[PDB]
């Protein structure tokens, strides 16, 4: 029900998407940043467990909602900025890229762009 109200169909309708966008950006940063446990550089086999079908459907739905109310290249820039700046929860970032590649309209090349830069 908490992710249900987060789904900005009842919200985005009523609320202008200026302070709503900073809310979603802060929400993404606070999902990624908070409890950066499994910071092990050896979190390689765990990619298979962070596969899209194994990552909980509610996480997936939240990611879909955040993608609806925001844009692609904004989000890619924001990820580059975050992952370069500060610590990460690798569970959420790997599930997140797993959702990114399929949900966004061919963002495997805009992804390999900042991969090449990094």
């Amino acid at each position: 029900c908490w992710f249900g109200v987060f789904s900005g169909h009842t919200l985005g309708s009523v609320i202008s998407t200026d302070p709503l966008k900073r809310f979603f950006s802060h929400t993404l940063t606070q999902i990624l940043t908070h409890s950066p446990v499994l910071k092990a550089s050896d979190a390689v086999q765990m990619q298979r467990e962070w596969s899209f079908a194994r990552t909980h459907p509610l996480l997936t739905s939240l990611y879909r909602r955040l993608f609806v109310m925001l844009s692609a290249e904004e989000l890619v820039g924001h990820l580059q900025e975050v992952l370069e700046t500060q610590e990460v929860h690798w569970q959420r970032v790997l599930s997140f890229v797993s959702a990114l590649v399929v949900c966004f309209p061919e963002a495997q090349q805009l992804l390999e762009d900042w991969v090449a830069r990094l």
């Binding site: 900005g8 169909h9 985005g12 309708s13 009523v14 997936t60 879909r64 909602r65 993608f67 609806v68 109310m69 959702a99 399929v102 949900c103 309209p105």
Partner: protein, 61 residues
């Protein structure tokens, strides 16, 4: 009551195919009944008259 009455008149591969569908439901309704807006502007005009009437007793004193 203007903006609230208006805000009720506005309410009135697999994951790509759901993402795009939910974008379609929330395609910003940029549009608002002129008729409704007009209704409310009359109601407001009504009140303006008293309030303006009130300011004049005040900017006497």
């Amino acid at each position: 009551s203007l903006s609230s009455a208006i805000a009720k008149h506005e309410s009135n591969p697999y994951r790509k195919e759901l993402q795009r569908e939910k974008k379609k439901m929330l395609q910003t309704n940029l549009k608002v009944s002129g008729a409704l807006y007009r209704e409310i502007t009359l109601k407001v005009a009504e009140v303006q008259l008293k309030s303006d009437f009130a300011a004049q007793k005040l900017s006497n004193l």
